[model samples]
Target chain A: MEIKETYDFSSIVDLWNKNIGTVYPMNLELFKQNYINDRQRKKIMGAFNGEILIGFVIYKQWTYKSGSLKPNHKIGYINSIIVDINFRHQGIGTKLLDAAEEELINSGVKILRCGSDTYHFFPGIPLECLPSEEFFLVRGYKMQDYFYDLIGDVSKVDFKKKDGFKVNVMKPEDRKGLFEFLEKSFSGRWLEEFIEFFQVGMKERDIVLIKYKTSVIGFSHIYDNKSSFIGPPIYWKALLGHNYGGLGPIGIDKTYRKQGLGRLLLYESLQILKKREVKKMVIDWTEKDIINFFGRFNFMPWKAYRKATKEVK
Target chain B: MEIKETYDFSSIVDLWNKNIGTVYPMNLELFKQNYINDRQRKKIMGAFNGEILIGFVIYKQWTYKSGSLKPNHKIGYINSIIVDINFRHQGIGTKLLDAAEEELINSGVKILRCGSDTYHFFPGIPLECLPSEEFFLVRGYKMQDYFYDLIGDVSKVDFKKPSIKDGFKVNVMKPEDRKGLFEFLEKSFSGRWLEEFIEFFQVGMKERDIVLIKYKTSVIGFSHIYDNKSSFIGPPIYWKALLGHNYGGLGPIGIDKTYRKQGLGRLLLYESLQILKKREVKKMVIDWTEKDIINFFGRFNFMPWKAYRKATKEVK
Candidate 1:
C-alpha cells in the first residue's frame, strides 16, 4: 500500500463512483470545480495499492477572504473522503484522513469541519449515508447543527401585496443604495457577495430589493440557470430534471427586525421568481430556525445534512 | 436461470441500479406509476437466479383509450427490459422479451413498439443508449420517424400579435366558459386531447390554462399552457432543471375546421404565448412533435434539443 499526494481527477472520480456513487453521483467537472478551480487552499491525498487508487481524501482551508469580512475562526474542511467498497475494512480511510488532519493542523487551522467547504459537494455528510455520521463522531467531530436544502413549487405561491413597503427586482438606479444598505446592515459575507455580483453582469437582475419610501430596507438573492453565477441552490441543476430556481441569503436591516419585513421580502421574491416561471425553487444550506420560517411558505426539506466540526487547536 | 412473473420492486430496483441505473435512474414510486397504477393493461416478467431477481421486462397494451376516439392501430409496448450486467452474456434478456412478445401477439396487438407507452419513462430508447438501437433492429423492429423535444427561452419571444378578423375575440377561459370549452373540444378535438383537458379540470387546475378564441360567444379555437401546477407533466416540464426562473409548456393548440384557413390558429398560438410571457415563463418547450409542427414553432425560434427515434414492428 502506498500513500501519496495526487492530482489525478480521473482516478479520483473512478474510485468515487465505485464507492459512494449510488448516493452521490460524481463527474470529472464537479470534482475539478471543488478541488482544482476552487479559490480555497486545498490538498488531495490518495491511497494506492499497486497502480490503482483505493482511497482518497480532500482537505480545504478558508484561506481566501473576499472584501472586509474576516472569519471569526480560521477553518479547515474535509471536502470529501472515499474508500473503495472492497477495501473498506483495511484502514485505508483512516490513513488517508490521518494524513489530511495532520496537514490541516500544520496549516494553522483552528477549527476542522467535515464537508460544507467552499464550493462543497455536500453541505455536510449527507443524512442518507448513515454510517458516515458515526465515522466523524468517533474521530472527535461534534454535531454543531443540522442543515437542510428546501424545495417548493413556486406556482403554488399566492401573490400577496403589502402596502407602504414595496418590493421589486433590483434596478441600476437602486444599485448604489443597495450596496450601501448591504454594507451598513450586513457588511460581511453578504456584503462581499453583493460586491462581487455587482462586478459581474447578468446577476444584478437576480437580486430583489424591498424599499420603504426610496430607502432599501431588505434584499434577497434569487438565481436560475440563466444567471451568470451558479449559487448554492442551483448547484445541483443537472440532477434536478426540471426548471430550477434558487433563493438564499435573504436579509432585513437589524433596525427593521421584528417588523415582519423579512417574510414580506421572501414572499415578494418568490412572486418575482414565479413570474420568471421557475417551477421548483431551492433554498440551499439552511438551518432549523429558517426551515420553520420557510416552511410557512410550503417549502419542504429536499436534502438534509449534519454540520459536524472539531477544534484541532 | 428460472423465469417467472414477479412484483418485488425492491429487488428489481437493486438489480436495475447495478446494471443501467447509471443512465436511467429508477425509484420505487416511478416504477409503481408505470407498472401498477397505469391505466393500461400491463405485465412484469422476471428472470430469477435461485430466488434473486436478475432480469425483468415490462409490457403494456393501449387497451383503454379515453374519450370517443379509437386508435387506428392496436399498439403494444415494451416499457423496459433489463438483465443483470454479470448475467448479460447469457440469453436471459432474449427469453424474457420473447415471453412478452408472445403474450402481446396473443392479445391481438397489431403493432409492437419499444418504449413510448402511456406514462412512458422515455419517448423511445434514449438516443444516448446506443446498443439498444441495434438490439431492437435485429428483432425486426424498424425505425419509423425521429421525434424531438424542443426547448427555448420564452422571455426572448417577441410578442407579435396578428390582427383579428371580424367577429372573433380571444381571452382566458372563464369558469362560465367551462361547459362551452368542453363542448368545443369534444366537437373539434375529440379523443386524447379532450380527455386530457377533462383530467386537468378534474385535478383542480385553473381554467386559465387554456386560451380560447370565441366566434360570436362560441368557443372556436384553443391553446394550452402548463407550469408546475398542471396535472399532466408536459415535455417542457420534464427536463426542468435545465431551465431557469420559469418553465412553461405549450402545444395541442387548434382552431375549428371552419376557422382553420382564416389565420385564427396562428393568432391563437401567438396570443397564448404572449400570456405566458407576461406571466414570466422563462423557458418553454414543444415536446414529442414532428418536423413540420416543429418548423411552425421554429417561427418563434424553439430549437430542437433532444432527438428520439420511433421504432415499431408488426405483431405478425
Candidate 2:
C-alpha cells in the first residue's frame, strides 16, 4: 500500500465518478477550476493498493481575516475524502484520515474540520450516508453542528410583498450597498460568499434585494443550476439534476429582523425565480433556526448533514 | 456526398471541433443544450463520404408562435454548417445545404438562412472567414445587412459623466437600483431582454459592469460591460485568448424608445466605459453592431475589429 500525490484529473475524476458518480458527476472544467486552476493551498492525495487508487483525500487550509493588517488564522480543513465502497472496512478511510491528520498537526492546525473547508466540496457528511458518518462518530468525533439544504417549489411558494418595501433583482450599482449590508448586518459565510461574488463579473439579476422606502433592508441570492463559482457545491449537477439552482445565504438586517422581512425577501426571490422558470430550488446551508422560515414558502427538507469537528491538543 | 440523419452528438461535436474548433469550442453540455436537448423542431444532417464524416449541418424550422402555433414560417434556418477544414470547396457544403433546402422549401420554406436559426448560433456568417462569405455569395445568396464588432482601448476613452440635463442622471446599479433597472429594461426592451437579464444575472456583479441612464428619477437607458475578470465571459473568447484579463467588453446597450433620440445609449456606454477603464481594462470590444451604427461608434474611435456577414437566399 502506498499513498501518492496525483495531478491527474482524469484518474481522479474517473475514480470520483466510480465511487460517488451516482451522487456527483464531475467534468474536466469543474475539476480544473475547483482544484487545479488556482495556486491556493490544497493537497490531492490518493491511497493506492498496488497501482489501483483505493482511496483518496483532498485537504486544504482555510483562513478568515477581518482585515489585511490582521494575521490570517488558518486551520486544517478536509475538502473531501473518499474510499472505494468495495475496499471499505479495511481501514482505508481511517488510514487516509490518520495520514492527513499528521500533516495538518504539523502545519500548526489546532482544530480539524471536515467538509466545511474553503471552496469545499460539501458542507458536512450527508445524512443519507449514515455508515460514512457513523465511521467518524465511532472515532470519537463530536457533532460540531448540523445543516441542510431545503428544496422548494418556486411556483407553489405563497409570496406576499409588503406595501412599503420593493423587491428587485440586484443591479450593478447596488453592489456597494449590498456588500456593506453583508458586512454590517449579515456577516459570516454569506458575507464572504458575496465578497467573492462581486470580485467576479456575475452581474446577474440573481440577487434579490428588498428596499424599504429607499434604503436597502435585505438581500437574497439565487443561483441557477448553471451558476458558476470559485468552487462548486458538492454534487450540484448530480443531486439537483440539470434544471436546478440554489438559493440562500439570505438575510435581512439583524436589527430589522422579526418584522418578517426575511421571509418576505425569500418570497420575493421565489416570485422572480418562478417567473424565470426555476423549477427546482434548494435553499442551501441552513440550520434548524433557518429551516422553518423557508417551510412557509413551500420548501421542505431535502438533504441533511452531520457536521463533526476534532480539536487538537 | 451522402447526406444522412444522425443523433450522435459525440461524433457531430468531434466533427464540429475538427472544422470550427478555433472559432467555437464544442463542449458536451453546450452541444446537448443547443441542439439535442431542444424538444422543438431540430434536424442534424451529416455529409459522409463512405464512413468518414466530412461535413454536417444543423437546421431547425421556426414559427411565429411558440410550439407549432403557426406551423411553418416558410423560412429555413440553419444553426450551423461545418466542413472538415481539409475537405473545403469540394461541393460538400453545397450538397448539404441543397439537400436541406429541398426538404425545407418543399415543406414550404421560401428563404434559407445560415447561422441565424431559432436559437441563433451566430448573428451571421463570420467575416474573418471571407471564403465562407464568398462561398455563399457565389451561390446566389444576396447581400443582407452586415454587422461588425467594435474594438477600442477602454483606457484611452475620454469618459466623463454627462451633465444631468433636465433632471436626467446616470447611476451605477446598486442593490436598490436593480429592480428599477429591471423594470426599465423590461418595459422598454421587451420581456425577452428581461428574460435574458434574469437568466444571465449572476453572482459576480460589480458596480462597474453595469451603468444606467436615468431621466427624471426613472431608468431610461442601460449598458452592460464584461472584462476578462468577469464571472462569465459573455464576449467572444478570442478576445481573452488575445488579451487575457486585459480585455474589456461592452455591448447590448439600449435606451428606452422615448429617450433613444436623445443619445442616451451613448451616455450609458460612456458611463460603462469609465467604470471599465477605472478597472484597468486595456482592450475594449463592442460586439455585433449593425453597419449604420458603425458611424456612431466610429466617431468615438471604436473601430471595426471583427466583422460578421449575414448570408441568406430566396429558395429556388
Candidate 3:
C-alpha cells in the first residue's frame, strides 16, 4: 500500500464521492476550491494499493485572517475522510484516521476535531447514515443536531414558467445588480457565496435571473462542472462526471416574497439546467426551512449531516 | 448489581463533579432542573452495587409549547450518563446504555441521542474527561464541533459598567414583568429558551434569578441569573455550589437584535455582572456559548472554562 500526501484531485474525488456521490458530486472547480486550500494550512493524504485509490483524508489547521488578531488556542479541523467500499472491513479507514490524527497532533493541535468548521462535508454523521452512525458511535463520536439538504433529478423537473416574467442567463454586466440583489435578498454565507460567484468562480449564464420588466426580482445559480468549484454539485460531479448541472442558493426579491415568484424561480432554474443537459442537481443547506415548495418537485432530502467534533485536551 | 429508576442524585453528582466540580459543580437544584425535566418528558435510570451508587443515565424527549407550529423531527435527547470511575471498566456504562436504548425505543423515540439539546449536563462530554473519548467511541458514537461556555473568575475580570442608554432601564424582574418579558422573547427569539424562562420565571420574583432590561417601558431583553442564593443552577448554576462560596451565574439571557451593537448587549453584560458583583460573588459563568458568541463576552476578558463536544447515537 502506498500512503502519502497526494495532489491528485481525481484520486480524491473518485474514491471519496462514492456513497455520497448522488448528493455531493465532485468536480475540478470544487477540486480547486475545496481540496486545494490555498488560504489555509492543509494536508490531503491518500492511501493507495498499487493503482487503486483506497482511502483519503483531508485536514486543515486554523486559517489566518492576515491581521494581528490571533487567538491563543490552535485549532485543527478534519474536513473529511472516505474509504473505498471494497477496502472496508480491512482496517483501511482506521489506518487513515490513525495517520491523520498523528499528523494533526504533531502539528501542535492536540485538541483535534473530527469535523469541519469553515467549508464542511458532514457536520457530524447524519443520523440517517445508520452504518456510519454505528461505526462512529462504536468509535466514540458523539451526536449533534441534524442538517438537511435537498436533492432533485433535472430530467424529471416538470414545471411551467409564469407569464410576464422572463428568466434570462445572467451576464458579467449584470454583476452590480446581482451583488445588490444578493445583499438585499440574502446576506451572510449565501450573500458571501454570490460574491464568490461574482469573483469569477462562475461563467456568464451560470446564474439564471428572473426579471419583472428588467428589475431582477429573483435569481438561481445553475452550476455545471464548467465553472462551479465549490458548493454541492462537486460531489455529484465526482460521481456523474462534469456535465452534471447543479441548482440553488436561488432567491427572489424579499419585496416580492410570499407571491408565487419564488416558485417561478425554482422551475425557471430547473428548466434552464435541464436545457443544459445537466443530469442531477442538489440544493444544499436548506437546513432551515423557509418554504417547503421544493417538496413538490422531484427533489428529495438525499443526504444529511450533523456537524460535530471529538475533543482532545 | 441493581438497575433502578429512582436514583440518589448526589451519587452521580458526587462522582462526576469530583473533577468538573470547580468549573461545573453540581447540586440538587440543577439535578432537578437539568435531569428531572419538569418542562419536558424525562427518564433517569441508575446502576448500583447493592445501594452504593455506581452509574446513572438521564434522557428526555419533547418539550412543547401550548400551541401549534411544532418543530417536529422531535427527537429524544440523552442528557447525560456517568459510571463510577472505579466501576467503569466493568461495562456498566454499556449495560446502562443498552437498557436505556431499549427503554427509549419502547417509548417511541427510536432515534436516541447521547448529548443534551436543552438544560444539558454537558454538550457531549466535557473535554476534560479523556478516557470517555475511547469509552464512548467503543460504544459507537461520533464526535462533533463545539457548543461552548464562557467563564470569568470575578477577581480576574474588570468590566466597565456602561450606563444603560437613555430610555432603557435594567431592573429586577417583577411579577408584572412576566407578560412583557415573554412577549419580547416570543417575538425575538425561538420558543425553546422561553420554556426554560417559564420555569425560572415562576420560581423567581426571587432576587438574582431573573433580571429585566427595559426599553422605555417595554421589556426588550432579559437574563435568568443564578447567584449563591439561587438554586444550584453549574458553572454558574453549579459553580456556586462547588465552591460553597458566592458565584454569579448569567444565562438564558437575550436582547432584541434591534438593540444589538447599540451597546445594549454590553450593558446587559455589565449590569448583569454588576448585579453579581454587587452581591460579591467570587466568579461569574456564562454557559452554552458557541464560537462567534464568545467574542461578545471576550470584550470583557472572559475566558472559557469548559468546551463541550456533541456526541450522538440511535436508540435502536
Candidate 4:
C-alpha cells in the first residue's frame, strides 16, 4: 500500500456531516481566531494506499498559560487523528502518530499532549462514544481530570402553588437591574463572562427578566448568533445571522427561590425568542440532571466527553 | 421565608456519599455521570430569607423509553420551588407562575427530577468561567468533561517506545482463535455499570479479530476490541481493571505518521485494528484522545464521544 501526504477534505465531509452539520460543525471562522495562521506551527499527515486515502493526523504546537499571574508555558495541543477502516493494520496510523510527536518535539515541546475527550476547546468525543480513551492508553498516554459540563432546560416546568407570580417580556431598561443582580447576587466566574459578553456588544433586547410586581427577581441572557458561543466577538458577527440564540447566566435572587421564579423566567426567555422566529436555543455547559430538566421540554443530548487523563511522563 | 421539604437518604452509602459529599457538595460527580438521586433532589427548591431556608417545593418524576418490555419501572426525578428571600415580593413569583398550570401536568414518568447546585446537575452560569458551546447549548447534563481525580501517580510512564513484536510479544487472533482471551476480558470487566467498557464481553473473538499486544503473557496493548455498528473498538475491554495492564489500548501500530517515527507498538496497533476495518468495519471510536494518539488514529476520521469524569473540587 502506498501512503500519501494529503487527501481531499471533501471525501470525508459526508462522514463528519452527520455528526457536525447543522448541530455543530467546525466553524472555520472560529478555528481561524483560535489558530493563528502560522503554517510552521501546525502539520497534517495522511496515509494513502494507491489512489485511496486511508488515515490522517492533524496537530499543532503553541504556547499556553497555566492561568496564574506568572503565566507558565505548556505545549499547546494535538488537534485530531483518524484512520480509515479499509486500511487498518497497514501500519499507516503509527506513521502518522510518529510524525505528530516528532513535529511537537521539533517545535521544542518538552511535554507532548493532545486534547482529550474532556477539553471542550478541542472537538473531544461524541456523547456515548469511547474509542479515544482506548487509543491513548495503549500509546502510553496518561489521562487528566477536568471540569464537567452542566445543562438545564425550561420546557415542561411545573410551578406548583406559586400562583401569584406571572411571566412577562423584559424591557430594555431591565438590563441595569439584571446586571445589578448578577453583580450583587451571582458574582465570580459567571459575572466575568456576562461582563465580557456585554462589552463585546451583547444586545440588551436579547435579555429576559422575571418580575414579581415591581422588583426584578430573575434574568436570562440570550445570544442570537451561532458562533458567539465559541469564537471572538468579531467571528461571531461574521458567521451567524439572526436565527440562533444562546441562553445563560440566568438566576433568581436567593430570596425568591421557592416561588417557581426560575422556571417562569426560563419560559419567558423561550417565548421571547420564539416571538423573534428563533428555531433553536442552547443552554451550554451544566450538570446532567440539569440537562434532564431541559429534556422534559424536548431537547436531546447531542455531544458529550469523558474527562480522562494519564499523568505526563 | 419559606422552607421546602427535606428527604433524608442514609440508606445507601454509595448513594449517600455520592449525593452529599460528591453530588451536592461539589456537583462534579453529577456533572460526570449526568444523573442524581432522591435525598438532595427533594431539597432542590427552597425559599431563603437573609440566607435562611424557609418554604420549599419538591417535585418527583421518572424517564425512560415509553411503553416497553423492561423490568425497572418508576425512575424518579425531583425539582424545588421556594419563596424565602424576597418577602417584599410576596406571591409575585407565584403570581407570575400560575399554580394550576404548575400542579396539573402529564403522567407516565418513572424517574423523579430534583434540583441541587451542590450536585451541579443543571448547568450554572457564573460569567467568569469560559462558556461551553456544546455543553451549554447542547442537550443532556454536563458531566466532568475534563480534569483528573488523581487516583494514582501518573508520573511513572517511561517515554521509550517498546517493540511489541519482540520483547512484549504480539499476535493476531480469530474468533475460533481465542475463546479463552474473549472469556478473560468478559470475566475481568463484565457486569460493571460502565456499560460501554463491558460491551465487548458478548462477542466471539472470531467475529472480531484484531491485534493483541502483551507483556510476556498478559494482554496489554490492543488495536481493536470488537466490532460494533458505530466503529471498531480500539481498546475494547469488558472492565476497567484491564486498563494499564500492558500499555492499555495504544494504537498498537507501527508507522508514526507525523514525521516518520517508527516503532513496534504503533505497528501492532495499526496492523491489528486496521485489519478489522479492512474486513468491513466502517467506523471506529478511539475512546479518549488526550495523548495525541487519536490524531495518529485520526488518520481514519474517528470522532470521540460519551465523555465521563469526576471532579476534584467540592461545591461550596
Candidate 5:
C-alpha cells in the first residue's frame, strides 16, 4: 500500500460530505474559511495510499513567550487530525502522525502539541478518536485540561411581576439618558462597551429598558437583526443578517432591587424577540450561576472547553 | 452642568493620556487601531461638568454566537470607562454610564453588560467606582465568570540528559527538512497551528519551530516559537511578555510516555531555545499549567496573574 502524501481539497470535501455531513459542520464555505482563507499561518497535511486519501492533519506555527521575557522559537500547534475508518489499525494513523511529526521536526519544531475534548461539538467525542488520544499519550502527549462553552437561551422566559415597574422598549431619544445611567451605575468595567456603542451610532430599537417614573431602572440589548442581546444593546438591530441574537447587560437600579425587575426586563426582551420572529437566541459568556439563571428559560449546553497548559522548560 | 452627550475621540485621547495612562495601554495609535479603524462599531461617551471633563465610557458592537446553537441578537460589548480621580462619589460616573445605556437603548439594544477585573489595568474596576461589583449587582448586573492570566519564564532552564537510546542526537532542524517537518505535524500535531504552520510557510527558522531528531529515525519532539514583537503568541505566551525577551511556548508533547521522566525531554527543549538565543530570543512563556508544575517553574520566578478564573460551564 503506497502511502501517498498530498492534500487535495476536493477529496477532503467528498470524504466529509459522505461521512460526517452536518454533524461536523464541514462544508466548502467553512473549509475554505478555516483551511484556505487562513493562508498566512496555517498548514495542512494529508496521507493517502495511492489514490485513496486515508488520513489528514492540520497545524499552525505559533510563537509564544518563553520565560526570559523574550520571544522563544516558534512552536507548532496541532489542530486536527482524521484517519479514514476503512484504513484503521494498520498503523496508518501512527504513520500519518509520524509523517506530520517528521515535517514539524524538519521545520525545527521542538515541541508538538494537540488537544482533544471528551465531549465536543454536537454528538460527542467519537470512540475511534479515543486511540488518537492514546496515540499521542503513548507518543508523549499529555492529557491537558478541558475547555467549556456555556450557553443560555431566552426562548421560554417568564417575567416575574414587579410591584409597579414595567419593561418597555427603549426609544432612540432615550439613548443619551440610558447611556449616562449605565455609565454611572455600571461604570469602569460596565462603561467600556457603552462608550464604544455611542461612537459607532448604535440605535435604540434593539434595546429594552426597564424603568420607574422617568429614571431608567434596567436595560438589555440585542444584536444581529434582533437575534442576540448583550448588555447595552448598542448595535442590536444594526447587524446586517438574521444571525443569532445575544441577550445580556441587563440590570436593575439599586432602588429597584427585590422587585424582580431583572426578570421582567429579560422576559420583555424575549417577548419582543418572539414577535420579531427570531428562532434561536444565546445568552453567552457566562459562568455557573449565570448559566443557572438562563437555565430557568431552558437554554441547554452547547460547546465547552477548558484552559490548560504545561510549563516551558 | 452641561450634559455633553457626543462621543469625541480627541477628548477620549486626552483623558486616557492624562488620567488613565497605565490602565489603558492607549496611545493615539492603539486607540485608532481599536476604535477609529472600526469606525462603524466603536463608540465613546464623555461627561463634562461646566468646563471640566469628569468621566467617559467606551463600547463596541459585536455579533457572534454565544451559546450552543446561535445568538439571538446583536450584542454590544462594553469595553472601558474612566471617572476622574477627584470626581469619585459625585454621581458623575453614573451619569456617563446612564448616557451610554440610553444611547444603546435607543439603538434597540436588548441587553447591557460590563466586565471588571479585580486586578484591572486602570483603576477602572476600583472598589469605589460605581460601587463596582455592587454597583452592577445593585443595577441588576450579575457577576460573569472571571478569567485568569498565567505567566512563566524559561531563562535558566536545566535540561535532564536525553533518555532516548544514545544513538538519538536531539538537535536544531535544518532548512531542507521542511516537508518532513510538515508530515510529522500533519500526523502528530494535526488540526492545530503546528499543522497549519507546515501548510502556510509561517514557521520559518527566524522565529518558529525547533525540532528533535534521531539519526536515521523519524523526528521525536517539537517546540514552536513566536516573536516578542509579534502579537499572535499562543496560550503558552499568555503573559510571557512580562518576562521581556523573545517569548514562546513549550508543550503539548515533550517526551512520549515511553520516554517519560527521562532527561531527553528537557534536553531537547533547552537545546531548542539555546539555538533561538543565537537569533536573539530573550524572553519566553510556557503558559497554562496546573499548580504543581507552576511551583516547579516558580523556581524560575514566573509570576501568576493577580486574579484569574478557572471556572468552566460544561457544554453538554
Candidate 6:
C-alpha cells in the first residue's frame, strides 16, 4: 500500500462513503469546500493499495482571524482520518496520522487537535462513532466537552416583537455599529466571522440586528438556499428541499442581556426568515447554554459532536 | 380567591386550553391519563377567582417501582402549574404552588421537581414559557441540564441494514410472545417503554404493530410501529397531518444493552421500516433519541423535528 498526496476528489469521496459516509454523509461541493479548495496552510494525504484509494487524513494550521491573531499560526487541527473497514488492522491509520503529524510539527505547529477546525466536516469525532474515541485516545488525543446543533420547523413559531426594541435587517449604514457591538460584546471568532462576511462579497442584509436607541444590541446571521455564504444551518440543504433556512451564531451585546431582549431578537430574526419561506430552520454549533436558549423555542438537536484535542511535544 | 381539590374536568380543560394550550394543548382523554386516573397519592388543586376557574396546580407522589425502589417515595413532582393570563399578578400562581408544595411536604416528599414525572405533560417547563423559569427560580427552583425530543419523516428511508449476527431472528409479535416480551422488557428496557407497551396492548393496537427480535428462544429486541388508526400517541405522530394519512410512527425500539453494539438495532429498524413502507405508510417518525442515536438514524435519512429542556427543584 502506498500513502500519497490527496487523491482525485471522486476516489476520496467514494472511499469516504464506504467508511465514514454513514455518520457524516459527503458530496462533491462539500468535498471542494472543506478539502479540495483552501488557502490555509493544510495537508490532505491519501493511502492507496493496488489502484484503490483506501484511507486518508486531513489537517490544517488553525485559521480563525488573520494577521492580528498570532496564536492562529501556532495551533493545528486534524480535520478527519478514515481507514476503510475492509482495510483496517494493517496500520493504515497510524501511518496516515504520523504523516500528517510529521508535516504539521515541521511547519512550526506546536499544538495538534482533532476535528472542530475551520470549515470542519465533523465538529469533533461524533459521539455516534464510539470506537473513534479509543483510536484517538490511544494516539494521545484527550477528549473535551460536547456540543450539538439543533433544527426546528420554524413555520409554526409565532411572530413576536418586543415593545421598546427595534429589529431590522442590516443596512450598509449599520455595518459600523454592528461591528462595534460584536467587538464590545463578543470579540473572538464571532467578530472575525462578521469581518469575513463583508470580505466575501455577501450583502450586508444577511444580518438581522436588534437596535435600542440607535445602537445594535444583538444580531443573528440568517441564510437560505439562495445564500452565497453557506453556513451550518444550510449544510444539509440537499435533504431539506427548497424551503429550508438557517439562523445561528447569534449574540447579544454583553451588557444588554438577561432582560428577554435576546429571545425577542431571536424571535424577530426567525419571523423574518419565515417571511422569506424558510420552513425548516437550523441553529448549529451550540454548547449547553446556547442549547438551553434555542430549546426554549423547541429546536431539537439534529446532530451532536464531542470536542477532542491532542498535544504535540 | 379560593383553592379547592380537583375542580370540574371541563373547567380544567377549558382553562388549560386558554392558557397552556398552544405549546401543550390539552384534551379530555390526555387530561384524564395524568390528572384524573391514578392509584398513587396525588393532588389536583384549582383556584376559583369568581365563577370562572382562574388557575390550577397538580402534584403526585413519585410512583415507579411499587415497594421495590424506596427512593421513589421521597420524591414528588409538580405535574403542571397554570395561572390564567388575565389572572396574573394577583398571587394566584404563588398560592397554587404553595398549596401543592405544602401538600407534598406534609406527605413526606423531600424533592419536588417541575414537569417530568409519571405521565408528565411537560418534560420540564417548556422553554417557551421563559417567565415560568423566573417564577420557579425566585420561588427556590434551580434550573438544571437540558434535554430534547426529535421527529423525522421516515418514508424516504431506503431499505438497508447491517449484516445480521448468526442465529438472530426477526418476526412480528405472536400471541405466544406476550409473556416473554414483557419479561424481556422488565429485564432490559426502561420502565416507561414497558409501560407504553402495556398501554399499547390494552388499547386498540394489534400484535402486528410490534416487530420482535429474537435469539434462540429469548426475545432480544423489539420495535413498535403504528399508523393513524392506532391509539398510541407517540411523539413522532405529532406531525401526522404533514406526513398525510399514510403517516406511520416508530420507536421505543431497542436491543438488550448487553447485546448492543452489534448491528441488531439497525437490522430491527430496517425490518420495521420494511413493514411500514409495504403497508403504504408514506412517512415514518422516530421520537426522543439522543444525538448519537440520532446520527445513527441519520444514516436512514431521519430529519430532526423538535427539542426540549428538563429541570428539577428542591421542595421547601
- Interface DockQ of each model: 0.01, 0.01, 0.01, 0.08, 0.01, 0.06
Q: Local error of candidate 6 at B151, Å? A: 9.5
lDDT of 5: 0.49
What CA root-mean-square deviation does each model show from the true structure? 23.9, 26.3, 25.6, 16.4, 25.2, 6.8
- Runs in model 1 lying further than 4 Å from the true structure: A27-30, A34-37, A71-74, A157-159, A196-202, B1-316
DockQ of 5: 0.01
Candidate 2 lDDT, tens digit per residue, A1-313? 7888867777777777655453345776677766753323678888898888888888875534321222233477777787764566687888888877777778777777768765556778754343355567766567777777666545432344567888789887888888777677766666666665556534556688998886788887777754555234223544454456667667787677898787678777877777777765677667766665765554555555668887777
Candidate 2 residue lDDT tens string, B119-142:
455668854344466567877787
lDDT of 3 at B193: 71
- Tell me each candidate's TM-score: 0.49, 0.47, 0.47, 0.38, 0.33, 0.67
Q: Which portions of model 5 show Cα errors greater than 4 Å?
A: A1-313, B1-14, B17-25, B36-40, B49-52, B64-74, B105-131, B160-228, B231-301, B308-316
Worst 10 residues of 6 chain B by lDDT: B62-71
Model 5, span A261-290: residue lDDT tens: 676777677777767766445553344344
List per-prediction Cα lDDT, in the order shown. 0.74, 0.66, 0.64, 0.42, 0.49, 0.72
The docking category that best describes candidate 5 is: incorrect
Candidate 6 local lDDT, B29-125, one digit each (tens):
6576445444467778999866768888888886545322333777888888887655677899999998888888887888888876756666676
Candidate 3, residue B35: lDDT: 60
Scored against the true structure, residue B196 in model 2 reaches a CA lDDT of: 46
Q: Which tens-of-lDDT digit does each residue in B54-80 have in candidate 1?
A: 899989888876667764337899888
